[PDB]
Design a protein around this ligand. Structure first.
Ligand code: 7XF
Ligand code: 4LM
Ligand code: HCS
Ligand code: HCS
Ligand code: H2S
Lengths: 398, 393, 392, 392
């Protein structure tokens, strides 16, 4: 009944948006433009592609048809005007912030960040005269209080890596509308399938597409989505001049392949993580567990409000300290010991004996890392196998 | 002895016996790497165990490419990145902070110029352009703030050369780091590290790939400097990660680098001889011509005069446009170092929205045409240039 | 012991054997070298765990083969450049002049062409029988019957064979049973667990799932697969799979369970919808209680599949108009892609024929085949609804 | 006509037809869709003028085919999954029971195996004759002779056939001449210009040049190639080339002239060196004045090639010591890689064999075959020199 102005469903757009086989000789899958350069029919047509007249292509670092399809598709999924594809999540983050900030500007930051994002801010751009301040983005009164006339960007992850701390994106956007700041949200953990910060009033979203968007752990990639004006600026300054973080057309095509199953994969990641999280909460050895789908989650209602499903990531604390975590990790036979997330393969990290092993018990405390803490990226394996693996690894941790 | 260049370009750093006898190295198209124990994992993030954890930091396919490029440039260490701009920005973001000065060659690749003036230069880094062939002017331009000297040699548009050894001697007195963009020559024709440069950068998109189908960058230098560029510039400040797939294609291209460069040079030498005596041509810049102003310096630094030609047509902008439009084998495109021959005329292409005085300011003649001479049969390339020249009347 | 999804992701691979790489490195190499001539000697002799040449064997292909064997519950796998590569390599190996092959009544067109215009012109005898009629199959057996070959479900009406029933007859008489399991995949049906000797796939379809590679798979005993590798593939077809494409196929397989669940859920809704429409004369979908072999389908397949066949009341003209009207479904041969596909044989693959020729070959004038994809079912229903209106 | 290097880079592609892309986009798609069923029908009926399914045809494959056709001076090209795919698809199409095929005296092992253990077991008669002996060839011609098939140069001698002389005989009797041109490539030898009807290649070797793909090519008349495509490939082998690998093959072809120049230059230096060494019993290299067919080779081949065969004094033991001493050459099968390769069949491929059967075949106990690569000749000379000392 209801006519042709209806938005196609998410799965339909993830598979089809922006591509009609009739435009490429009937190829069902778009051909891969693995070409660095594009030629011009005449010297004037070439002039126009550099002088902003002619729609077209000239050099793959600036723009490429395979990348453009990926970009338009991601834009559709996030409810944004425009997309940009980059060589990594760090490429997306750095290209964005290098574009938007200059000496004397302030950036307001979420209290916890991905480690390399933190390092970029504190040891990179923050050493070039950009002022940094961290604020708890879940405390809208504190955020309001931290706004200064120099605040140019508000940047955060929700949920945040690795503690799953959340912010009310719409609440932040409302503050930013009143004051003027540009809001940038790292939406890696949720993907557009679970949360769409642009639809809640954020200006820009960034992704490590290396994670769930790819889904298969075989590419490194970044995405930015936002307004045409901001994404164009990031493309033509951040990417073109300031980072050179160009995505391979081969990898862009793999990313698109992954996006075709994004809904199905996220459904399974979330279903598996919910079962594991409920199981873990009932085990003798587990002292504490943080999963957005449990009512014990400190920001349960904000998670329910913003996220359509509670995600594939679990954090928990074992009784018995670092010795328990070490024995837990070494006992794992199906979960892999590794960094990253959003792969088909289930992954685990025990930061006390892995990423933060060089520190002592005191230093891990002020960062906020328990000696029995472990982060799980719950994969796509049979839940009974994952339960069996965690169950036997808990037995070895005792 | 040291194996020869062609041998190293094919073999360096890889023994098939280490990868199940595979003649061609397997492609590590993986974002993450797992650990057998948390102890093994711990050591990699601190950096005691020589393994892998994450492909943005390091990956075995990229490592082979890096080692091989280091061998060809005669440097300690290599780094592979998503583009030439990824190489340049990762390098300069690592080496420079507000109040530092970078001394620059008088002309640079457009986006390098843009990065410098509208990017890092807007974050408090000072820029000064100097003629890198004028050693007296370079010495006089040095200040206590000078931390990097950066240039291409040869440089667009007129293939102007720097005296690399002369620059390094000056830099050494002031502690400064010399960075050379060696894209045009490749390590097969010129090795700036052997002339005293500290670091070399490449757009591997060009000749190193050779086939126009990847975008990639390379940095080669000392272990200490390359480690910092990896762990700061790449890891944190650009994220310009090269795909293992593209790294494998780049290695495939490098296996024929000597043969391709020989042919690019042989073809350009013929085209330069032809163009230098055509009526339509006012000036020609080709390092292999006896009349090239820096003929002697060029021959000290470069083993062959390269695949690039720039020339100026007497009829100015109109002649340039007509020459370009008449080409049927040469393609109208930016880029260089492909099997396919390419041509551009900046006054009617890249720098077209500008006026004549803005182009002369930037150092771009109205009739300036640049050719990337490809690998096609020279008789076909000659016929194309000949008929284009007639059309330019 | 581990679950299907677990095995589809992990079986046969330990990252610690390959520098900790989570994803296996791709062995895109034609040849392999030897540390000594005698290490090389043993590889060609066949008593040395190694590699020499990717047409014979390659580690990327070997992982794919082992994983596919696991999923089908078989001993050994072989990867080939196409479904036809799998079928031809298999039958060229197993048959010689004077042998008889018993065939399902309806086969994929190029399988039919291979049998009748290829191997059948080299002295191999062919006979077609209804594999659902176990009495008729038994009556058709001779001592010269070497191979029984069929698809289940088969084109055009999704006609099924009782695989265990056929296998019993094969064991009694001494024939080798080869089942094309392309439509079901090992996720829905495992013919080797029902007594078949070999299964073949067009991995181009559901196993890949994404329409970007052409590939074939054979699974069966080590004895049979070794012969097919070393004769059919090595000497008689050269249908070698690219390691690049084998890697992509493994990527596809990692989501096979999830994709098939969605294909089947979508197809069930669409079939139930089609069954209620005035334009539709008849429908063949294994998940409808009306399906003639519904009981056998529920017994042999764990889900009813992603494929629908139906007949439009208005015949060839209605078929043409229906197909031409589709905006979301694509007009294409092939199946098992994320994208929904449709074909109407009377106006596409078999258009030059007369109606009577098509009836002889078993294709109705109004027969449309749908490969139901992974799009939102509401979008697919809307597309089919408007196209049915346009079919009049 | 543009020159060979120009055509190897550009033939059949204008960037303006694919959005200005300097490098053609890779059509990694298994299927193609139709705007209407009528358009789709037209594809399956008899015309082409478009695309349907990548096993039949694909734009990436089509470009490779057209370019190879241009380089060989043929009407039409076909790309396949391997050299064996090329050979089998060709011979399965051209031969039926009762036909005879005349073969060169020695063949590539798997070609030999296909002929004798494959197609020869389906009622096709085989007969080996010296393809340099035109009187002997004329004598062997019967009314059933449908195909003449050979390599030139052929292992292990680098024995040359008189291609124009064979073709004259074939045209009188109405036989099709198929030449395996793998060793020379179209850059060195064009058998179609000497009167061959079809050429086949293992594009795995020199055409690729970089050891990273397996692929085959057929080039010949439109009428013959259309048959091989639509019968041999489509129905009888399914040896479909990946578009990814076809793109890599085109990448390799762009440097074919340069690579072959260097392979040939290096091989000549090593052959001249080997000729003057006391360990070497005899040497087969076409560029030595002492080569028995030196004149014929120069008439057919523009350069003497990158392959050397030679015999060591010391037989099998000396071969083993030579091979195991190599530090830059790799012990491997295959040829035409950037990397220099060596093999000693007595102790590698034909090692399980006893020295008795080897004798009446071409396989001497001392026979070593070198695929001379692109490395610095001084390094290759040094490696060969030290291995010869170790052989004693
Ligand atoms: C929320 C978020 N934002 C950015 C990144 C960096 O993306 P990348 O540059 O593609 O690796 C990531 C990567 N996270 C990995 C990094 C593995 S080294 C992890 O912590 O497990 C991320 O999770
Ligand atoms: C266009 C192709 C279709 N079918 C193919 C097919 C093959 C042959 O598989 P390759 O194409 O050679 O991988 C084998 N076995 C079955 C049950 C098949 O459906 C089609 O129907 O639409
Ligand atoms: N250096 C080349 C390609 C980059 S756009 C050029 O300027 O034409
Ligand atoms: N003609 C090749 C075969 C590779 S298996 C060789 O003789 O080595
Ligand atoms: S088909």
């Amino acid at each position: 009944m209801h006519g042709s102005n209806k938005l196609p469903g998410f799965a339909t757009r993830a598979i089809h948006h922006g591509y009609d086989p009739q435009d490429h000789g009937g190829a069902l899958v778009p051909p891969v433009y693995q070409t660095a350069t594009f030629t011009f029919p005449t010297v004037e047509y070439g002039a126009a592609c550099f002088a902003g007249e002619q729609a077209g292509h000239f050099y793959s670092r600036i723009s490429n048809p395979t990348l453009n399809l990926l970009e338009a598709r991601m834009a559709s999924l996030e409810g944004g005007e425009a997309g940009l594809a980059l060589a990594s999540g760090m490429g997306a983050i750095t290209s964005t912030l290098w574009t938007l900030l200059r000496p004397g500007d302030e950036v307001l930051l979420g209290n916890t960040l991905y480690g390399h994002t933190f390092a970029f801010l504190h040891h990179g751009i923050g050493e070039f005269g950009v002022k940094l301040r961290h604020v708890d983005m879940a405390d809208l009164q504190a955020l309001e209080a931290a706004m200064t006339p120099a605040t140019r960007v508000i940047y955060f992850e929700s949920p945040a890596n690795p503690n799953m701390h959340m912010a009310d994106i719409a609440g932040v956007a409302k503050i930013a509308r009143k004051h003027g700041a540009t809001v940038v949200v790292d939406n890696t953990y949720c993907t557009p399938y679970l949360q769409r910060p642009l639809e809640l009033g954020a200006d820009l979203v960034v992704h490590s597409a290396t994670k769930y968007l790819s889904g298969h752990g075989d590419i490194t990639a970044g995405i930015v989505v936002g307004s045409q004006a901001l994404v164009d600026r990031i493309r033509l300054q951040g990417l073109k001049d300031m980072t050179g973080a160009v995505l391979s057309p081969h990898d862009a095509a793999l990313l698109m392949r992954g996006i075709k199953t994004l809904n199905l994969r996220m459904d399974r990641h979330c279903a598996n993580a919910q079962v594991l999280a409920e199981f873990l909460a009932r085990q003798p050895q587990v002292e504490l567990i943080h999963y957005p789908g449990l009512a014990s989650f400190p920001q349960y209602t904000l998670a329910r409000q913003q996220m359509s499903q509670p995600g594939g990531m679990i954090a928990f604390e074992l009784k018995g300290g670092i010795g328990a975590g070490r024995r837990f990790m070494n006992a794992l036979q199906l979960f892999s010991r590794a960094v990253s997330l959003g792969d088909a393969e289930s992954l685990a990290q025990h930061p006390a004996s892995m990423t933060h092993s060089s520190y002592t018990p005191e230093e891990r405390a002020h960062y906020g890392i328990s000696e029995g803490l472990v982060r799980l990226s719950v994969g796509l394996e049979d839940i009974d196998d994952l339960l069996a693996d965690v169950q036997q690894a808990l037995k070895a941790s005792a």
